[model samples]
Target chain A: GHVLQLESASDKAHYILSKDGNRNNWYIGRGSDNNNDCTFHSYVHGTTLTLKQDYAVVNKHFHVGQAVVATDGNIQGTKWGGKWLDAYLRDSFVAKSKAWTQVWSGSAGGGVSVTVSQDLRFRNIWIKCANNSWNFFRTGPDGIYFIASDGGWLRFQIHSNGLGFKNIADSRSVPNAIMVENE
Target chain B: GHVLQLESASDKAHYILSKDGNRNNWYIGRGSDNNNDCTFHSYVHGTTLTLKQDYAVVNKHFHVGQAVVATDGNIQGTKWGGKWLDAYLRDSFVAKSKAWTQVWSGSAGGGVSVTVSQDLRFRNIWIKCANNSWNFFRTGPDGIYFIASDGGWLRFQIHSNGLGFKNIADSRSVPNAIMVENE
Candidate 1:
């Protein structure tokens, strides 16, 4: 019904639930040493059992039970195409919601930066390919900010005095929204 | 030891594991209408709990165990932020392994997606949120694909007029030496 056999207290070598031929795998570090102990196969779907690995050496901590379904909505990495469903926040790692269409294949020269914590919450999102950029609804440290809650209200800079639209909640400097390019 | 009660069969509102005031919550739709029943508060961490909600109505399928710890990292809701840790395939969820750090609080907008299966690999993943877009692994409509097998030589898309790079063994495409982008 629900198989589970995860051992590693010097049990020898564990993480079983094996079954080949008919298909049903996951024989990590099997008992003695079949060949080195590290089988594969089990990548079930219905009851959700994905332990595929390019490299997996978990000691602990890996909880989940709400949502994480990727049948093939794209999360490929055989050789770069763009599909990074990340969420590792503590310092900074956000890929916030809705509107996705990121492409960075100029020989894998990646670039995507989008930060708009608050304020009216505009919806141009932004996207680029040549220079490297994609933010269907999400970026790094480039420009276009309009946060508020007691902070900056407007800011759009590429710098060099070429492009700048500051309002920083009334600090002043609108100049006509933005239209800089003299270089 | 490890309480987990998730029922729903005409049992008149299920999903329990109560104990308020003392500490410990998660009474989704308790018995006899306490006003629809959908309590909260069992958002533990370390062992990883996270059953908090401004809204939740799981019909079935929600298994968790390993590591999706959330002790106040952020998953709020008012408008839009980003934080969700899901992994509920068929049944019996297990959040096994490492890697954590997820936040979403545009007020409390959440986000998390992880689903990959083949068999009893077990490793409870997680998911949620709205206003989409986020992937740090990869996927794009433009192109750039490089998967491997025998010889193994990953390479894919990014064409800005000239830059296709593809060599999945016998497959084709032309470009220079990427090595793996600069970084």
Candidate 2:
């Protein structure tokens, strides 16, 4: 339930995390041409994810490919890796502070976006990935990732800083402790 | 530099985290005896841990015996342990929400206190313990620890959660992500 310019790289067309009917779908306070409006919420069910404006309004849809669980184990030995039962979207493109890059990938990258699902029961946030390898996610450098891939936004991660959900051992990992938003 | 009644359990004396000069030393806005007196800052040396005012008077003294480093590894396939170079108090007493208890000990216990020192140089919070184990600090239960050992205070920890020092893997460590203070 979180951040940024929900857009498709191919279409370069803006995708909203919220439902399409409302002008605010996926509109997280950022201004745009259409200025789509409406507050939104998202959910995942068996590889299928959708942003819902209400019980009947299905706003957005994305596929959930892989998953991992947070462990009661430590990452490396410094930062505590949260044992969240969250999942990260694989091969997903997100807006980085610098550019659009793929998380869990060694590619050089905007306000990027990643698809994720969190299970409150487990106290974790799951991130989507480009690769379907269900292992811990780590970053080698300290990168800033804005919530939105377009325009301007707030909330970010200091990659590899250990402020994330599951197998995310920054410091000894990547993705620093970041924002907690209900997009 | 954080938490619990800064008291001398042996003397039944309540202490504050602040300096003694200001009638606030160890006085964390809590209501108590003479309310103790002062806002405090503590420093550590070879074996001397002291609370000070300006640069002249020493408000308190606690011994510092061990230290550790936070790492950049998955604690145990889960939690990302922070890579901080903070220290923990050896053989320290801390207040638990339930009763006065020892953090690293398997003992059953209320307002407990463990002495700690966090170095801002590294983005990590340090803690002190009774044992010089110097590895990771972990808790086995979900507990709440008050700032003051006696009177009611704000801030606490959900022990065994990943929120502390190096090698402190709560999911795979203990000392859940707690409050960040200057005292």
Candidate 3:
């Protein structure tokens, strides 16, 4: 008999899911849902990039792994559907570009320092809590993905009760992963 | 029987408290509690006074019998408060500066005019509607006033309602009028 212990300082922890936490009750999603379910209808708006300042903004010129912060607009701690999500500040970073989006990355905290692996470009970006229906204007090409650390993950799903892990014979939680695309 | 038949277009027509017609209930005022009331609360840390164009102006000096029109703000329908209450672009005037206030002195309802009497003055005059709020920096010693032909009265009240009225009674519809000291 073998046993593996999992842990974290935050309430929500992310895992790679070597095994489905519970196949009977498992689901996948990018943002969040307006309703409380894992059916994948997170009420989020696709990335809306704006060329102007009134649109969401990050420090000029995004790099693969920089500490991104917000400058303006309501980005953090907003409600989607019925769940609360984190909006980013102006000077934040891009955890990953859209090119290499598949490999499951483990979680850390804040925002995981990831790479674009290629020349990345975007206008602006926003987190679409699972079921949110509104899109704050984008900086430019809007959508970008990042690896949510402990705090980011918990804050993103503070509005719902479905963001955690279950201990069963065949159970594993999904890591706090973010994925996005641009036109 | 004093049969005072003010021509329909006479400025005196509005001030005449007639029997079978509109009466002197047409009073305007400046103060916090009374109708036609006017108030100014200054807040200047890094405050700014912006005027959009030539049309955006502040008339600190007004002559009686002349009309002064504005897209919005205060006008002196009749200045009664002690010290000739400083006319603004919204309060006492808007409460009373109706069809009779200025007579649409401008050609084809273009400009606002006034006639000089006791010599009244304006402080900060802002003229704007919904999208624009620009102040007309009026400069002078006399201030502004709207004098009646024969001491006919025009009542004004300053209610907190966001819009100006043509007469004192118009303010009754918006019971938010707060009377304050105008001296």
Candidate 4:
């Protein structure tokens, strides 16, 4: 599963939240004082996590949104997009033995965190947002993980679909990359 | 001006020579003696500076021997190579943008290093080396400037000759589509 955060002007504290803890939850990180701590939700509505402020220079979060995948016959030309994915490919951060795509929403911004039940899978991955960036990491137990500059963390596992359990091109003609973290 | 280092494997003595100093004077950084505190030299070598060995990593000297503009093109490939230059890309690290095929042979491993009397100017650049990869850089009064990592240790610069710099091109020729930075 993926989590997202929205940077919006709205001021609604609560809504008909997702009661399925398996689907989503809300929590915040603890700090020395209340002012230092931020109130955050694990999932916004039913599928996003939102952070009120960025504590560090680089802010990071798991964004579960829709991606636009190409249906063109050209395999190589069809695999890239967005700030996060562009830097990944430009820097040689993934392997070539498999296929992958990079995508992000350019017009809108949000925030949320989503916990995963299973491991996230990918042929390759990269996430760079805010002033910070995430280095692609693959470990034995956790599979893969991303560490960002602003103390933002996201763990990944392998899933069956191209990006993750979610398919982007099937839904919106563009493939979306999904990041997941397990309990 | 820069400082030069000359080492003799034939004899054990070494010298730290400065390019800008009077009569190109030479000082000694190391010897077969037990005393490690020799006066520090004003110049640093490309090897020590390239690997970021630290201010005190080594006091070894490297003699460039000769400066030849290699029109043979860079052997490393586009992952670290920026773009093709087709004009009178002149001398000095500041005014020109060019590529190099480096080869070094000594007690240490053979590699390439760029020496600049001024800041290096290029529109696009790519490095095709490994983890201990070789990258492009310029040295000046400020400090050693390089484009090795994706963060602040390096920054990108552009020139009027359509010189906008990005990481490198992907297999499909998209500049930011491949993800290869991780090992």
Tens-digit lDDT track of model 3 for A1-183: 433343433333222111112221111211122322212110111111112223322122211111111233111111111111131211222333344232123442333233322212222223322233212211111112121222221111111121221111111222333333332
Q: Candidate 2's error at A109, in angstroms?
A: 7.2
Q: What digit string (tens of lDDT, one per residue) describes model 1 on residues B51-109?
A: 22222222223332333223222122322222232212112221212232232112111
- Model 4 segments more than 4 A misplaced: A1-124, A132-142, A147-154, A158-183, B1-163, B166-183
- Score candidate 4 by DockQ: 0.01
Residue A8 of model 2 has an lDDT of 25
All candidates' TM-scores?
0.18, 0.14, 0.12, 0.19
Q: Write the per-residue lDDT of candidate 4 for residues B80-123, one digit (tens) a residue.
A: 23222212111111232244422211211122223222222311
Report the C-alpha lDDT of model 3 over B1-183, residue by residue, as the tens digit.
Answer: 011121222111111111224322222111111121111111222221111111111122222354422212112344433222223322333221101111111111112132322222332221111111111122234322221101122223212231222223211111111111111
> Local error of candidate 3 at B128, Å?
29
Worst 10 residues of 2 chain B by lDDT: B61-70
Off by over 4 Å in 3: A1-104, A118-120, A123-175, B1-183
- Chain B structural similarity (TM-score) per candidate: 0.15, 0.13, 0.15, 0.15
Give the top-scoring candidate (TM-score).
Answer: 4
Poorest lDDT segment (10 consecutive residues) of candidate 1 chain B? B118-127
Winner by lDDT between candidate 3 and candidate 2: 2
**What is the docking quality class of candidate 1?**
incorrect
